[PDB]
Amino acid sequence: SMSYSWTGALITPCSPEEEKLPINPLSNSLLRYHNKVYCTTSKSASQRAKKVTFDRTQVLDAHYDSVLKDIKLAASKVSARLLTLEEACQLTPPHSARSKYGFGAKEVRSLSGRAVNHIKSVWKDLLEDPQTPIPTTIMAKNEVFCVDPAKGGKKPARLIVYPDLGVRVCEKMALYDITQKLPQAVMGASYGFQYSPAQRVEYLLKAWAEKKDPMGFSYDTRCFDSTVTERDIRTEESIYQACSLPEEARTAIHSLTERLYVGGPMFNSKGQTCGYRRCRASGVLTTSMGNTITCYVKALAACKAAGIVAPTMLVCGDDLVVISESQGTEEDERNLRAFTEAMTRYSAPPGDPPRPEYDLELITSCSSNVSVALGPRGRRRYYLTRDPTTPLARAAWETVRHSPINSWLGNIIQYAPTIWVRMVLMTHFFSILMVQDTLDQNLNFEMYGSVYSVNPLDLPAIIERLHGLDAFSMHTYSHHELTRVASALRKLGAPPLRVWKSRARAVRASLISRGGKAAVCGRYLFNWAVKTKLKLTPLPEARLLDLSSWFTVGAGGGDIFHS
User: Fold this and answer.
1) Where does Mg(2+) 2 bind?
2) In 84-136, where does DSSP find H-type helix?
3) Bridge partners of residue 144, in order along the sequence
4) Which residue, 32, 314, 403, 484, has most beta carbons within 10 Å?
5) Among residues 175, 199, 179, which one has the least CA distance to residue 189?
6) Checking phi first, is residue 132 left (phi over 0); if not, alpha (psi -120 to 50) or beta?
7) How far apart are CA 202 and CA 313, in angstroms?
8) Residue 113 DSSP label
9) CA distance 358 to 490
10) According to the annotation, is 220 in a ligand binding site?
11) CA separation for the pair 167, 134 (Å, rounded)
12) Which residues pair with 112 in a beta bridge?
């Protein structure tokens, strides 16, 4: 079966689209080479459409059957409940795509206007009708990148496929509690979304250390969502139904599976019939959980089929890392090829073939790698980092074009211990917040496929809680980090790090002059910039923070909100 079929109707924008980074003194102060920064638009939708359209073949075997059997037995210990309409409404992000039925996210969150009566009717229809396909909209995403002439030509827009807001709320009622309990039960420690960045590092470090002779690889599935078959999606349902659920949840989950998850008609923003999908929908509640479970089953089965020795896996949606006992150089290459051949039979063929690596820091997981620096009193501190190019490009865009989602804020939180966050992003955005005089305002941002709301004045407490007090005292960064960061800054025409340090001294002083929480940000976030450093004490606020809702499996398109 083809992942998609197409009518020929265009994938159309639902609003004007800017391709180019605008010139502007605030963004220019971060990076000067605005022409290297671009935003994807519907103009390239057809190029992506071609890429994600292909035939799938799938042949399963004893290895696959055995893993699935184990997974269903584990699921059988889970009990999950329906969410109330009220609960599901509160999980809706404030700027979630508005319904065609005369209400938007604001109405959903306040349980006002047409929203409640409509959602109830949608739910009743899910219970009564398990058959009729539910319409979805396909849209080209607008995402910002830096040109990479080496990797030849700008990236085509990603495509997102999602049903109406009314349906999305129903998905939460049926399946949210499942997203919170099932992945851990069936995949245990292998389930990546339960880990904060620090915990992820700890997990990877432990896995590597417990092998006598570690070899690890990441496996890149070519367009994972398109490789997911109808049978895969029904198998996901069978796993959900293995849990102990009230009949009403069972009914709704089955209807959503058959009407939405397994496939359905796609319409463009103009309402024209655009195509038909027979693969994973990228914008549904179960996209991340489903990808994670299905990737895990195929991967574990492929380890057994290939004879991978002592695999420890880290699975985050379609992102897959496998750490195991090296059997020798040639043997590893052979065994990775066997692993790839099994994955391919399971309908998860590779994009780039996997490569065996023999240093943990060379393993990329969700675009991130492990690095090390020194904390106070010289102890080694391992932490998660990444190439800062895309974060910086987006930071520049979001400086001049405010978005409902502040990727920069997500990057500061996730990568707080990094040199590029500390010297560049923190310096730039605290300066900007003071220019705007909006320091004390909650901002939304995305992280692990979920939306969160954070007041920048709480960053010191949040960072302490997530990364430890040492995140404000790290120094002696790695050669790789120093070089990669300096190269990114030169590439984008941004000031060099030494200039950021001088700027930071002034940002710090300005924050401190304002007193209160601003001065705390000044003292803690910018202690790195001053010659005479302060002795930083544990922040009481750090303990009071309720981060219980942080780091869970997300939603497709990130359509989940915590606050």
Assistant:
1) 220, 318-319
2) 85-90, 105-109, 115-128
3) 39
4) 314
5) 199
6) beta
7) 14
8) T
9) 30
10) yes
11) 9
12) none
151 Cα distance to chain centroid: 23
387 annotated to bind ligand: no
For CA atoms 489, 408, 162, 347, give the dihedral sign.
positive
- CB of 65 closer than 8 Å to CB of 16: no
Rounded Cα gap, residues 280 and 161, in angstroms: 9
DSSP secondary structure, 341-410, as one string = HHHHHTT--BSSPP--BSSGGG--BTTBEEEEEE-GGG-EEEEEE--SHHHHHHHHHHHHS--SS-HHHH
SS3 108: helix
The dihedral over CA atoms of 111, 115, 117, 121, expressed in degrees to the nearest 10, equals -130
- Residue 232 labeled ligand binder: no
Long-range contacts, stretch 362-368, CB < 8 angstroms, 24+ apart: 363/204, 363/216, 363/217, 363/218, 363/321, 363/323, 364/218, 365/192, 365/200, 365/204, 365/218, 365/314, 365/316, 365/319, 365/321, 366/192, 366/316, 366/319, 368/197, 368/200
Take residue 320 and report the two structure tokens written for it.
Answer: 């897959």
Residue pair 153/400 in contact by the 8 Å Cβ criterion: no
| Strand blocks (E) in 159-221 | 159-162, 214-219
Cβ atoms within 10 Å of 135's Cβ, excluding its own: 17
The residue assigned the tokens 């940000």 is 521
PDB resolution in Å? 1.9
Per-residue DSSP letter, 5: E
